[PDB]
Write a protein that binds this ligand. Structure first.
Ligand SMILES: COc1ccccc1N1CCN([C@H]2CCCC[C@@H]2NS(=O)(=O)c2ccccc2)CC1
Ligand SMILES: COc1ccccc1N1CCN([C@H]2CCCC[C@@H]2NS(=O)(=O)c2ccccc2)CC1
Ligand SMILES: COc1ccccc1N1CCN([C@H]2CCCC[C@@H]2NS(=O)(=O)c2ccccc2)CC1
Ligand SMILES: COc1ccccc1N1CCN([C@H]2CCCC[C@@H]2NS(=O)(=O)c2ccccc2)CC1
Lengths: 461, 461, 461, 461
């Protein structure tokens, strides 16, 4: 009879929860737990996205306002990773002096709720530091020299800092000039909700940088905002977020227990089944359960990081967003397990799994050609094309070209001044596009759609 | 003999009108009615589009002229949903004062036929309203304060409004400043046709908005134009439009009667046929007739809304255009019924219907992956990418990426300042594009083109 | 024996010229004539393109220089079909006065070889014409008023034209102001080749246009250049072009004779062959010969127009370029006849011809859906999208969308201010793209590639 | 027994090196040599790319700074191949005078380590040369006139060069004005590494060019930088690069010997095998070895050019980069030989080789249509479209259109001013896109994927 029991157990382990309830009236509380997990994970992600969106928007708006206030002739958009640049010793001095003067007159210029902030030494003021190669006759040692400009110093009606010997820069040895100051800000966008407003501290540095010594000074503006207590403010939900993240952890922790319990009970049946198939003469490792375990781990980690961020009032949410986003992606991918219960949808999951090994084998061959083209394009078209400047950019450009993106602009960005490089670029682009788009991907398509012929006839039989 | 009669009736119901006329000399006046309906529906839509195009063009041109007249240093294109922005207390005051001064000198500045308009209180002038948080020590109650500036007040040779205590704004509590005025305009573009010119009233508001309190004031210019009687004007087709819309209603109403009569007579034959197949041992619901009924309903509704709009002289034609456009789309789709009479074209309508269920089943699986990627991309790349700012934008970006659109720019819009987010964006984009473009759509293609193998061999047999 | 003669004739008519020479030693002078025709037609087209490219470049460069000289604050690129626009009565007067003043000082401002030209009345000067509605109280009659400003009038040291009653414009009735003048130019780019330089006459009009009466004056600059004799010039190939165009006509005329002779001799064999198949019990109309006849006609017409243009010194080469370009396209398409002699390439011409009827039948069904979407998109998204403004633009936008072009920008160009139209645009774009790109074109592909299965197995058997 | 020996030799020659070592314990030192070659070739290319990237970046940054210093009102981006342009005799004089004045005040304006350089005559100064047609009455001989402006001449407090008769240009005969000077620069970006800094000499020419005589002067700025010894400089790895390039040559030279030895031993076996198949009754030319020989030749040539460049301190690395990049591309393509040892990957290399002849035969037919469309589009749309200006641009535009790139912009770049050309452009673009994208490429796909059906069933059998 134990043979019949083993057969009935193996039949039970292979049927859908709907069929389990139809047959043996076993309630699918694990399925309900998973649906609840989907709903709560998505809810937590959406709430987190909305709140952190608000905070990031406030910080970026303040940074843009600071750039308009302190960078002379700022166009409103960054030239590059740096905000603006100058090419003349006079434009350089005017940019520096403009920044200092705008800081002096901050209260009469700003449109927001800005104020001067105490620095790291607990004194309101402006710090200017400059680095020179100490001296045609220059040593490699950099001579740093700083000055602390108070509000009293800048507010002297005859200004003495402008004429001081500090601001006479020898631009041929200059490495950089850095201006540092602190500002205190309040977002009044929140007080309509009776929430006490959040007070932020901005640590701003303007770097007038010519490490390149190529005739251009690049001006970088960096604003680092942190959240501090509102020391002085009179304006006539932390628990709810924290408990919700605890419920998400508990549910995800419970799903970890149930899935691992399910996997263990599956391996027990494999042990039993081999016994009946050792005397008479991935099936029990569900690949969906591995995905569910990874998703639960990532959701727990992301929730712990989120609670830590909210507890100690931090504003960088990158790593927590990367864990929560990946876990949500995997949860929504794992919903495909419930659809695959209905065999009508299963034949479409099987057609992808069958095509995967041929795709991987084919990527090995196409990958080598792709790498060769990447190296060639970087070494040749690097000095003459902005889509080929470094290797990572070349890889992305070739990927986009394979997908047809921006072909004419890519062809037209090579100036015909060098005839040899122009001819080579034409040959390179034509050969890469023809080869990859018309042999490589056609063979690839052919491999996949026809492998999907066999799953289609294999399920018919 | 009644069996022969039933067979002849079922044979009659299944033959094309061309065959009906060839066999029993029955004139296809229903087909002629449908062709007339196609022609008149398209004619009405084209006439409506041309006229409303004219009106919208006039309104937009006047709005652009107003922005150039009243917004200081307007670049000619909107920065965003708002027209322009300022970052300094002095630029803010100059924008406000420029708007007021340009309104004062309107007659000497405008190039069109503009005049001052009486406001809601029937007095020519300008209204300025400002909102502050009533008072570091601010309450949540907003204190509104308005002033009505007449033409006499602005025309005083020593201007007193500039120096008044109203325009001393405390920008740290300011919520917004709103300037409201009315203008009367005439389009003389019509008088070449003996038509009396249409006189419009523009209700203009300029909003100097800093609800964000982020250091930037956004300036919104909104012009609401309505059509009024020309009270004073001396310049040395309504019936035709209204009757035409009545004929469109009648024809569409008639097509509703005939199609519903046809459907009822079809269900009678189903009743009869089952009787012969209950003793001896969608075919009668034509899916085209459902489309024709929906199209007739939408055309009647759109025509009624159109007549209402023309009767009471309204200028918002959105809902009427959405009904008329959808009804015209459905009419031109329904022309495919006449082509499908010829079986040579029928095998191509059958190949799409057969492929539809597999497409829908496949969308369920691909939709879950798409949703997971949407959530992940929004939560992670939202703060660092303008194509991922909100969920709807992320969905559109992923759709465009699947279709290959703007891949290199999408790859290049992530600044490499955060190495972790940059690496994740690379992984995210590569995985999404590879997965969707090379497994998902290949299986999809394979499903559809091969299902079109079976209709092709199924019609051969 | 006449039966054997008929069979031998039909065998002769169906073999390639290479086989004709291999068998009966018949020289293929017709093939040599066709190769000569290809070479000479392409040569004529290339020479014509190079010369007319030079002339067009000169004219466009002069027009750009004129726009910079006479249009105030010209940005260097046209705003629209019009060059620039103004919105103020003062900017309007300054633009007009700037144009007149720059004309007065032309000799001291121009960088080229420009001079004043006599007008249609043979007098050097400037003409200003203005149109008003003759007079709140305006009649539909337009009152035109012109003034002729001589160089003496503009050169009076106290200028009297500025203060004259002519230039007091009532902008509320103004239709337009037009400024007309002539300039004489010489291109010295030619004298390096001993060719006498070509002297051109520019007829320039500046139109300050506010027919719309919408508050904006659009400024159009039109320069019409013609070539005249150099009356006064001292600088210390017409036959060759004309004879070459005569040889092209002769060769194309000869090819017309030979092809029509070939077609007639083909129809004689059809007559004979039916006689043998009327007692015993496109094959003779070569579709390539129709193409060759059309190409010869077009080349002769284009050459005649080209000779006429060169004879009477005209500078508009549009119609001649459209005939020559189409004839060259058809010649290079007709080269496919020689490749199709080798049966290895023939099976690829047969696969396209076989697929054509299914493509045409399918376009009829897809065309109706395309038309419905075009009408719907124009009526709804016309007022809110610049890619949907008129019907032709909508058709091009839908074509590009089917080919995947600029999908994200199309999705993002609809402002979300109107929620109803925004939702409809989302639904419209998603439905059109999904439908056309994933059912319509998949069925199409499937039709074509599989019809190419049958030609591939039909030639095997 | 010699028959058995011949069979064993032929079996040895056809087995993979892994199988050779598995069977006869023969170490695959040739395979190890090839892997070492891959690693060292890639290493050399990456090092070369990084260093030449640094040098090119320095030169381009200095050129940009020079353009900002000496070109008046330079926008920061080049208008075209020329940097900027002027249209007035006054803007022309101001640009020339601005360049000369900025050169005079170089030491007080530059942000980098710039100094005056001795010219070709070994004298510090500025040279201005002008070309006129010597004199309505102009001869074809160009009269060149130069002036050498010293620092003493420009530094005279009353400047005499401005008022001199040299700078009175007759712009109607002017061909060009050229300003030439030398600058000495040092990149201090290197001294942090104890490397003595590299001193560069810049030979700058500003060309005020109006050869066209079309009313516009184009201003070209060309900077030619070379590396010279630092004559005067006090700042408190050549061998390693040179030896590494020698090892790359040796390894590539060795691979040439081994591959050619392998090919010869292969042809010996062909000779022997035919003997056994001459009495009883590409297989021995490996196509990979041809690729390896070509790659070794190119790597040796590129390394020799690289050593020559580094030895004599040259800064143009184009030809050397084209040889090294092509050789690296071919090395990474040749790695596909090792994967093809495993027959699982071999069937994917065989499917491409089998499809190649059909692709080539098909390109001959499609190429003729492509050429016809190219000629037609250039001759017709050349004067009205910037993507059709010359034949090479037309070819690239049609290639991009076939790949779907920028279709709507291509459709919209034709102004509707000429109705005939506009209609023809619509017809041209629609016909080309429909034809090529929907018949030509569908037949092509069909040819390739189905040929990949036969290799797939041919390897099964
Ligand atoms: C992610 O891999 C890559 C990512 C970025 C660049 C190159 C590659 N690889 C992959 C192989 N080659 C690809 C080149 C262009 C597209 C066709 C080839 N396959 S695939 O689409 O990317 C693919 C990969 C994995 C699963 C499914 C499909 C080239 C090197
Ligand atoms: C309209 O649906 C969508 C609209 C917008 C985004 C996503 C989806 N869906 C649909 C399924 N998935 C699609 C992802 C990219 C394209 C391939 C998949 N099918 S489809 O082209 O859009 C389709 C749908 C219905 C009928 C015919 C074809 C993903 C979720
Ligand atoms: C030139 O015709 C058109 C031109 C412009 C717009 C629409 C159509 N038509 C044609 C049919 N439909 C097309 C819609 C998008 C593309 C697929 C359909 N066929 S096709 O590519 O254009 C084609 C036509 C003739 C021969 C070979 C292929 C839609 C209406
Ligand atoms: C490199 O050749 C070309 C390069 C640039 C323009 C035109 C062609 N040719 C080639 C043939 N025709 C092409 C037109 C558009 C694309 C389809 C046709 N084949 S292909 O992709 O370029 C191809 C070629 C060789 C091997 C594999 C594939 C048109 C003339």
């Amino acid at each position: 009879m134990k043979e019949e029991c083993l057969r009935e157990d193996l039949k039970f382990y292979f049927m859908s929860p709907c069929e389990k309830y139809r047959a043996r009236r076993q309630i699918p509380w694990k399925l309900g737990l998973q649906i609840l997990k989907i709903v709560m994970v998505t809810t937590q992600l959406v709430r987190f996205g909305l709140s952190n969106q608000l905070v990031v928007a406030f910080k970026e708006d303040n940074t843009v306002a600071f750039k308009h206030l302190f960078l002379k002739g700022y166009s409103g958009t960054d030239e590059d990773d740096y905000s603006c640049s100058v090419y003349t010793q006079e434009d350089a001095y005017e940019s520096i002096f403009f920044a200092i003067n705008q800081y002096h007159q901050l209260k009469d210029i700003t449109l927001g709720t800005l104020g001067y902030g105490e620095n790291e030494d607990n004194r309101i003021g402006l710090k200017v530091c400059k680095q020179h190669y100490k001296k045609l006759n220059i040593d490699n040692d950099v001579e740093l020299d700083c000055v602390q400009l108070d509000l009293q110093d800048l507010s002297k009606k005859p200004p003495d800092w402008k004429n001081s010997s500090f601001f006479r820069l020898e631009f041929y040895r200059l490495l950089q000039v850095e201006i540092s100051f602190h500002l205190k800000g309040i977002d009044l966008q929140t007080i309509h909700s009776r929430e006490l407003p959040d007070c932020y501290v901005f640590q701003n540095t303007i770097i007038f940088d010519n490490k390149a010594h190529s005739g251009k000074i690049k001006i970088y503006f960096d604003s680092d905002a942190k959240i501090e207590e509102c020391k002085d403010l009179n304006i006539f939900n932390a628990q709810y977020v924290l408990v919700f993240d605890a419920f998400v952890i508990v549910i995800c922790l419970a799903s970890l227990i149930l899935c691992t319990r399910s996997i263990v009970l599956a391996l027990r049946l494999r042990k039993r089944f081999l016994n009946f198939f050792l005397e008479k003469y991935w099936e029990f490792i569900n690949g969906w359960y591995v995905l569910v375990i990874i998703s639960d781990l990532m959701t727990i980690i992301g929730s712990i990081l989120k609670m830590e961020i909210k507890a100690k009032n931090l504003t960088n949410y990158d790593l927590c967003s990367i864990f929560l986003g990946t876990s949500t992606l995997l949860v929504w991918v794992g919903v495909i397990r419930y659809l695959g219960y209905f065999q009508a949808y299963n034949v479409l999951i099987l057609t992808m799994q069958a095509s995967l090994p041929k795709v991987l084998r084919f990527c090995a061959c196409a990958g080598m050609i792709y790498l060769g083209y990447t190296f060639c394009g970087w070494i040749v078209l690097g000095p003459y094309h902005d889509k080929f400047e470094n290797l990572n950019t070349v890889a992305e450009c070739l990927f986009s070209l394979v997908n047809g993106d921006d072909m004419f602009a890519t062809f037209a960005q090579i100036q015909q001044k060098s005839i040899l490089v122009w001819l080579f670029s034409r040959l390179y682009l034509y050969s890469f596009i023809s080869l990859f788009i018309y042999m490589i991907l056609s063979l690839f398509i052919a491999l996949i759609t026809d492998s999907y012929d066999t799953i289609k006839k294999f399920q018919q039989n």
